[PDB]
Design a protein around this ligand. Structure first.
Ligand SMILES: [Zn+2]
Ligand SMILES: [Zn+2]
Ligand SMILES: [Zn+2]
Ligand SMILES: [Zn+2]
Lengths: 227, 171, 162, 55, 81, 41, 234
C-alpha cells in the first residue's frame, strides 16, 4: 500500500538526459533492495544520433557555434570568425572534416571533445538540447601516444554502439510518438497527449473508445429523490 | 505557526454509501480523514471551519474500482512549523541525546550539540534531567525553542530545536 | 515545460503554499491569514461549538481546559489525538482570553504594516524589550524602530489577561 | 460544462456497485431492472455535456 | 469498443505493476520506503510531489530501457496544452 | 576564462572561440606596353 | 625581455617545485630554460626514457602548464616524421594556476565551515551516514536511541567534532605557504602578457644539442585554410 495519490498518465514528455540528471538520478545491491528495503521498480546507477550530429555540425560553424547551410563553406564574418567550414563525412563511427585549399585538401578527424565544445557554444531548451544511466537489475594519464588513445576511444565507441472477464464491468460489457512505434521524439522533446488507443494500451489505462469515450459521474439530485 | 488555509481533497466513497444521504458521509470522511492528519505540504491540519459549507463537486465513478471520487474544497486551520521560528512548549521526554518539546501537534527535538555548554545531562535525578547552575530542564518544564530545521515528509513532519541563542530556554 | 529558496522564517521565505498573496475558493485575492495563539484558540473553539450546535440540531485555566476537553471529545471523531494536544497547548500558552482583548490586539498591531507572520509572532511570544523581540523575530530588523516596538510591547502587556 | 456503448458501461458500472452492497432503488439483472424503470442515479459526461440516465 | 475488457486483459490478466513517479520529473526514480511511509526523488530534493500509477510491467521495462538508452520518457499526470 | 570572470578574478586568457582568423578594344596599339599604368598620381 | 616574463617564470618555478615532485621540476625547467624543446631532445637532456617522461608530460599538459605542438617534418634524406614540441603558454598557465589556487582555498574554507556544523550519525553495521535532521525521525518509541532503518540497530555519533581547530590550522598553513603565488599573481595582473605560440616561443630559443634531429623551425603549409583546435591566439 502507498500513501501517494493514484493518478493516470495524461502526457508522455520525451526528452534527453542531462549529465547532471544522470548523476542525480543514480543511487550508486543498491540498485531485499538495499536502497528501499523492498515492489522495487529498479534504481539506476552511474549511435542513433550520428546523422543528427553530422547535420548539426554542417549547419553551424565549427569554431564559434553560430548559425551560418550545409553547402555554405564560409562563416560570413555579422558576428563571426571567418573560418571556412569543412566538408564533414561519416567514416565508421567517426566524423572527418576536410578543408579545401585556396593540392589535395587538408583532412583531419573532428574529436568528440571538439564537437561537444562547439555544441555547448551553440545558442528544446529544457527537455532536449544538442549537447545531450546504468539499467537496473530487472532490465592518457601517462604516456599513451595519440595512436593508443585513438584506438582505445574507437573501441569504447564501438562497444557503446553495440550495447545500444474477472469483474462485473467486463462481464456486463462482454499522432504521438508512442502511437507511431522514439529517438527522434526525445531529440525534439515530443509531447505525447496519450489520446490514442496505442498510448493507453501501452500504459494499461482505459482507452477513450466505446465505453471509455465518456465519464460516468454520480448525481446527488436524483439520489435524494429516490427515497 | 498557525494559519487558515483553503485546501482541497479527493475523498472516495464505497458504493455502499451511494444513498440519498451520501453528502453526510462525505462530511464525516472529511473530518475523520483530514482532522489530525499531518500533511507535510500544509502542516498539521487541525480543525475544519465552516463545517456546514464544504463544497462537494459532482463525483466521478472509477472504471474498475466502482467507488466515486469527490473533489472536496474546505477551510481548515493548519499548523506549519518553519525553521528560524520561535516556539514555546512543555518538555515531554528527556534522554542523553536530548529532550523533546511538545509544541501543539508537533514535537521539537533539542540535541546535545544545540544546547549551551553549561547544561549537562544527569540521570541521577528521577526522571532524568538536564541540570545547569541557573536552572534545571526536565519533563513538564516550559521551554522556549527556535526551530533550526524541518524535514517535511509526505505525511510526517519532524523538527530540530535550539536553545543556545539568547532569550531562549526556560521561561 | 517544468523541471527543477529554502524555507526560512527569519527571511520571511515561507515557501510556495504560504506566500503573502493567496487565492481563495472564490478566486478573490486575499492576504495570508496568520493567527497568533490567542486568535487561533478562539477560531478553533468557535468552530467546535458551531459544529456541536449543528450536530445537536440534526474563567480559570482548569475549568476552561476541562470544558474544552469535554467539548472536543463530543464533537470530534477518531484520530483526534493531535487536536487534543493542540487545545491543551493553546489554553496553557495563550495571552488573551476574551474576544475583546484579541480584537484590541489585532487593531493595535494592524497599524504597523509588518508581514502577517511577524505580527502573529508578536501576539504569540511574550517579550520585555525591543532587543528581545528583534533577536527572537529577526524579520523585524530594519522595519520598525525600537521606540515604536517598545511602546507596542508595553501596550501588549497592558491588555494581557491577569 | 455546457449548460443543459453508454448502456453497456452504465449496466456494468451499476452492476459492480450492486455487487459491492450498494443500495438498490428498484447483479447485472438488478442493474437492467433499474435501467428499465429509470432508477440509475448516474449522469453520463459526454465529451462536455452532462446527461442524466433518467432523462 | 470494449475498453474495460481491453484494460483487464492487458493489466488484470497480464503484467500489472505499480510505480511511483516524481511530479517534477516524470521518471520512475522515486525511492519509496513504504514501511515507514516515506518517498523521495533525489535529484529534485522533493518528498511531497509523488504520484503512483498502474502500468504494465512491460511498459515499466520499456521506459527503463529508454532511460538506459539516453531517452527520458517523463510520465505526467496532468495536461499542459 | 568565463568562470574566473564570474568569480571576480581578472583572467589572463580568453576563449579561443572568440579569436578571429584573417573592356572595349584598345585602339592605341604600337605603344601598348612601354607605358606603365599610373592609376593614382 | 621585460621583467614581467621573469616574474611569470618565477611563478611557474615555485608552483612546480611546491605542488609537483622532482622529475616535474626537471621537465618544466628545461622548457623554461629553452623556450621550445623537442620530445627527443628533452629525453636526452634529462637522460630519462620515454616511460618515465610519460607521466610528467601528461600531468603537466592536464594542468595546462605546458602546451604541445605537432607538425610534419621533411628531412632531406629521411622519411617524413611527425615531431612533437613542448612550450609554455603563459596566459593559460597563469589562468590555470589562479583557478586551481582558488579552488583549493575554497575547498578548505568549505571544509572548515562544514566542520562547525553538527556532527551527525552513522550506522556501525551498514556504515550509512545519517544527518542530525534525518536521525531525529528515526528514534525508537522509547525516545532513547536512534535506530537504523536498514539494520534496526542503535546509531553511533560521528567523529570530527574536535577537528575544528585542525582545519583552521590547515587553512592558516596553506595561506602562509602560498603567499608568494598571491604576490606573483597580483604583479602579473597589474601588467599585461601577450599570448605565446610556437612561432613566438622560437624567438627565445637556445638550441639544446649541436646536431638535434628535430628542426626548430615553423613553415606552415601555403594557402592552408585548415584550422585546428587550440592553435590560434589573439
Ligand atoms: Zn529498490
Ligand atoms: Zn565561425
Ligand atoms: Zn523528480
Ligand atoms: Zn545500518
Amino acid at each position: 500500500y502507498s500513501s501517494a495519490p493514484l493518478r493516470t498518465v495524461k502526457e508522455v514528455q520525451f526528452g534527453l538526459f542531462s549529465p547532471e540528471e544522470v548523476r542525480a538520478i543514480s543511487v550508486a545491491p543498491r540498485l531485499k533492495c538495499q536502497t528501499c528495503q523492498e515492489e522495487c521498480p529498479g534504481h539506476f546507477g552511474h549511435v542513433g544520433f550520428i546523422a543528427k550530429i553530422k547535420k548539426v555540425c554542417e549547419c553551424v560553424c565549427m569554431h564559434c557555434g553560430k548559425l551560418l547551410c550545409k553547402t555554405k563553406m564560409v562563416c560570413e564574418t555579422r558576428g563571426g570568425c571567418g573560418n571556412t567550414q569543412p566538408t564533414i563525412r561519416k567514416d565508421g563511427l567517426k566524423l572527418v572534416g576536410s578543408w579545401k585549399k585556396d593540392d589535395e585538401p587538408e583532412l583531419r578527424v573532428l574529436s568528440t571533445e571538439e564537437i561537444l565544445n562547439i555544441f555547448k557554444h551553440i545558442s528544446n531548451e529544457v527537455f532536449s538540447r544538442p549537447e545531450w544511466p546504468v539499467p537496473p537489475p530487472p532490465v592518457e594519464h601517462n604516456g599513451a601516444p595519440h595512436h593508443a588513445i585513438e584506438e582505445a576511444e574507437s573501441l569504447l565507441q564501438f562497444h557503446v554502439a553495440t550495447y545500444m472477464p474477472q469483474s462485473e464491468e467486463t462481464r456486463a460489457e462482454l499522432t504521438g510518438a508512442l502511437m507511431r512505434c522514439l529517438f527522434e521524439a526525445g531529440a525534439s522533446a515530443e509531447l505525447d497527449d496519450c489520446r490514442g488507443v496505442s498510448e493507453n494500451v501501452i500504459l494499461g489505462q482505459m482507452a477513450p473508445i466505446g465505453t471509455g469515450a465518456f465519464d460516468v459521474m454520480i448525481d446527488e439530485e436524483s439520489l435524494v429523490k429516490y427515497m | 505557526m498557525f494559519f487558515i488555509k483553503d485546501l482541497s481533497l479527493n475523498i472516495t466513497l464505497h458504493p455502499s454509501f451511494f444513498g440519498p444521504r451520501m453528502k453526510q458521509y462525505l462530511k464525516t470522511k472529511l473530518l475523520e480523514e483530514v482532522e489530525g492528519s499531518c500533511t507535510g505540504k500544509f502542516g498539521y491540519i487541525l480543525c475544519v471551519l465552516d463545517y456546514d459549507n464544504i463544497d462537494i463537486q459532482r463525483g466521478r465513478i472509477l472504471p474498475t474500482d466502482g467507488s466515486a471520487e469527490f473533489n472536496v474544497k474546505y477551510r481548515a486551520v493548519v499548523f506549519k512549523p518553519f525553521k528560524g521560528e520561535v516556539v514555546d512548549g512543555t518538555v515531554v521526554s528527556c534522554s542523553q541525546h536530548g529532550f523533546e518539546v511538545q509544541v501543539g501537534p508537533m514535537k521539537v527535538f533539542v540535541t546535545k550539540h544545540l544546547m549551551p555548554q553549561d547544561l549537562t545531562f544527569n540521570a541521577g535525578s528521577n526522571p532524568p534531567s538536564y541540570q545547569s547552575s541557573e536552572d534545571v530542564i526536565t519533563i513538564k518544564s516550559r521551554i522556549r525553542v527556535k526551530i533550526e530545521g524541518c524535514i517535511s515528509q509526505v505525511s510526517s513532519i519532524h523538527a530540530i530545536g535550539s536553545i543556545k541563542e539568547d532569550y531562549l530556554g526556560a521561561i | 515545460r517544468r523541471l527543477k529558496e529554502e524555507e526560512n522564517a527569519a527571511t520571511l521565505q515561507l515557501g510556495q503554499e504560504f506566500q503573502l498573496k493567496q487565492i481563495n475558493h472564490q478566486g478573490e485575492e486575499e492576504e495570508l491569514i496568520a493567527l497568533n495563539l490567542s486568535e487561533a484558540r478562539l477560531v478553533i473553539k468557535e468552530a467546535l461549538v458551531e459544529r456541536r450546535r449543528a450536530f445537536k440540531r440534526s474563567e480559570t485555566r482548569e475549568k476552561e481546559l476541562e470544558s474544552i476537553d469535554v467539548l472536543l471529545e463530543q464533537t470530534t471523531g477518531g484520530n483526534n489525538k493531535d487536536l487534543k494536544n493542540t487545545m491543551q497547548y493553546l489554553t496553557n500558552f495563550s495571552r488573551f482570553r476574551d474576544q475583546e482583548t484579541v480584537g484590541a490586539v489585532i487593531q493595535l498591531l494592524k497599524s504597523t504594516g509588518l508581514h502577517p507572520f511577524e505580527v502573529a509572532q508578536l501576539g504569540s511570544l511574550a517579550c520585555d524589550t525591543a532587543d528581545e523581540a528583534k533577536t527572537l523575530i529577526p524579520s523585524l530588523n530594519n522595519k520598525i524602530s525600537d521606540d515604536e516596538l517598545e511602546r507596542i510591547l508595553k501596550e501588549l502587556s497592558n491588555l494581557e489577561t491577569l | 460544462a455546457i449548460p443543459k456503448y453508454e448502456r453497456a458501461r452504465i449496466l456494468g458500472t451499476r452492476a459492480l456497485q450492486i455487487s459491492m452492497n450498494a443500495p438498490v432503488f428498484v447483479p447485472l439483472r438488478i442493474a437492467m431492472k433499474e435501467l428499465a424503470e429509470k432508477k440509475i442515479p448516474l449522469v453520463i459526461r459526454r465529451y462536455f455535456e452532462d446527461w442524466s440516465v433518467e432523462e | 469498443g470494449a475498453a474495460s475488457f481491453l484494460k483487464e486483459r492487458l493489466m488484470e490478466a497480464s503484467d500489472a505493476f505499480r510505480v511511483h513517479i516524481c511530479g517534477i520529473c516524470g521518471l520512475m526514480t522515486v525511492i519509496a520506503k513504504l514501511n515507514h511511509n516515506q518517498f523521495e526523488c533525489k535529484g529534485c530534493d522533493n518528498k511531497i510531489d509523488i504520484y503512483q500509477i498502474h502500468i504494465p510491467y512491460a511498459a515499466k521495462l520499456l521506459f527503463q530501457e529508454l532511460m538506459a538508452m539516453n531517452i527520458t520518457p517523463r510520465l505526467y499526470t496532468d495536461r499542459s496544452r | 576564462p568565463r568562470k574566473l570572470q564570474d568569480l571576480g578574478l581578472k583572467p589572463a586568457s580568453v576563449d579561443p572561440a572568440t579569436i578571429k582568423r584573417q573592356k572595349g578594344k584598345i585602339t592605341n596599339t604600337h605603344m601598348t606596353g612601354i607605358l606603365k599604368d599610373y592609376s593614382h598620381r | 625581455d621585460r621583467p614581467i616574463d621573469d616574474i611569470v617564470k618565477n611563478l611557474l618555478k615555485f608552483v612546480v617545485r611546491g605542488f609537483y615532485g622532482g622529475s616535474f621540476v626537471l621537465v618544466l625547467d628545461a622548457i623554461l630554460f629553452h623556450s621550445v624543446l623537442a620530445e627527443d631532445d628533452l629525453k636526452q637532456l634529462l637522460s630519462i626514457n620515454k616511460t618515465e617522461l610519460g607521466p610528467l608530460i601528461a600531468r603537466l599538459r592536464s594542468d595546462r602548464l605546458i602546451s604541445i605542438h605537432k607538425q610534419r617534418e621533411y628531412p632531406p634524406n629521411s622519411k617524413s616524421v611527425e615531431r612533437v614540441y613542448y612550450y609554455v603558454k603563459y596566459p593559460h598557465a597563469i589562468d590555470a594556476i589562479k583557478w586551481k589556487v582558488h579552488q583549493v582555498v575554497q575547498r578548505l574554507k568549505d571544509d572548515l565551515d562544514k566542520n562547525s556544523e553538527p556532527n551527525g550519525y552513522m550506522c556501525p553495521i551498514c556504515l550509512t551516514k545519517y544527518t542530525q535532521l534525518e536521525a531525529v525521525q528515526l528514534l525508537n518509541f522509547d525516545r532513547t536511541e536512534f535506530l537504523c532503518s536498514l539494520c534496526d540497530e542503535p546509531l553511533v555519533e560521528d567523529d570530527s567534532g574536535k577537528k575544528n581547530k585542525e582545519k583552521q590550522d590547515k587553512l592558516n598553513r596553506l595561506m602562509d605557504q602560498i603567499q608568494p603565488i598571491i604576490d606573483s599573481l597580483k604583479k602579473i595582473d597589474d601588467s599585461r602578457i601577450e599570448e605565446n605560440t610556437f612561432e613566438i616561443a622560437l624567438a627565445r630559443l637556445i638550441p639544446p644539442q649541436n646536431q638535434s634531429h628535430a628542426a626548430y623551425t615553423y613553415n606552415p603549409k601555403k594557402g592552408s585554410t585548415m584550422f585546428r583546435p587550440g592553435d590560434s591566439a589573439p
